[PDB]
């Protein structure tokens, strides 16, 4: 069905919420530009973790080294991927920011690959993938700026809630505490 007041295709999909199915959403692997989607990336029954974020965003990159640090903790059970988005603050766009990152608004791949780079030269290899230009994952898991997502066996485990800079990144480390918890018994 078409929607007469848009000319396009009626949306019949139901935005992410937890217990509820993890989109399947494209994204773009930077070697190569390939084709994947999210799940893809789960691994059989084990949790996978998404962070969604750019350069440009402070809050990701402010946590990135505490992600990067449940990602060594938490590793032997859970898997964690990046995923490369719009930029939060373009430096081409609007309102003039004084983000330490002078980046564009991605016109291509090209462009937002250059921009995970840069990210990427900390972080040594996490799994990071880019959205694709249609931004099909920021839209999916409704994760333009920042958020964090587990999924596991298709399902959503844990969304990041919005609200204060600060939680999130809490919140995600208690779902894996627990997690961790019930497979190995509390640690000491």
Same mark, same amino acid.
């Given at each position: 069905?078409?929607?007469?007041?848009?000319?396009?295709? %009626?949306?019949?999909?139901?935005?992410? =919420?937890?217990?509820?199915?993890?989109? +399947? /959403?494209?994204?773009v692997r930077?070697?190569?530009?390939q084709?994947?989607? *999210?799940?893809?990336? @789960?691994?059989?029954?084990?949790?996978?973790?998404? +962070?969604?974020? !750019? &350069?440009? &965003?402070?809050?990701?990159?402010?946590?990135?080294?505490?992600?990067?640090?449940?990602?060594?903790?938490?590793? $032997?059970? #859970?898997?964690?991927?990046?995923?490369? *988005?719009?930029? @939060? =603050?373009? !430096?081409?766009?609007? #309102?003039?920011?004084?983000?330490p990152?002078? *980046?564009?608004? =991605?016109?291509?791949?090209?462009? $937002?690959?250059?921009? @995970? $780079?840069?990210?990427?030269?900390?972080?040594?290899? &996490?799994?990071?993938?880019?959205?694709?230009?249609? +931004?099909?994952?920021?839209?999916?898991?409704? @994760?333009?700026?920042?958020r964090?997502?587990? *999924?596991? /066996?298709?399902?959503?485990?844990?969304?990041?809630?919005?609200?204060?800079?600060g939680?999130?990144?809490?919140? %995600?480390?208690?779902w %894996?505490?627990?997690?961790?918890e019930?497979? =190995?018994?509390?640690?000491?």
């Open positions: 069905g078409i929607d007469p007041f848009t000319g396009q295709k %009626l949306d019949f999909f139901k935005q992410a =919420h937890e217990g509820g199915p993890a989109p +399947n /959403s494209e994204v930077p070697d190569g530009f084709s994947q989607r *999210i799940l893809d990336y @789960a691994q059989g029954t084990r949790p996978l973790v998404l +962070n969604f974020g !750019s &350069c440009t &965003c402070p809050p990701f990159m402010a946590r990135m080294s505490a992600f990067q640090r449940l990602v060594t903790k938490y590793q $032997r059970d #859970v898997d964690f991927l990046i995923i490369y *988005i719009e930029e @939060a =603050h373009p !430096s081409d766009g609007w #309102v003039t920011t004084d983000s990152y002078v *980046i564009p608004q =991605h016109r291509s791949l090209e462009d $937002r690959v250059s921009a @995970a $780079r840069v990210l990427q030269q900390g972080a040594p290899g &996490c799994a990071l993938v880019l959205d694709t230009m249609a +931004n099909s994952s920021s839209s999916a898991y409704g @994760a333009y700026f920042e964090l997502y587990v *999924i596991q /066996s298709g399902t959503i485990m844990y969304q990041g809630g919005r609200g204060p800079d939680y999130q990144v809490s919140e %995600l480390r208690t %894996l505490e627990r997690y961790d019930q497979l =190995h018994g509390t640690r000491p």
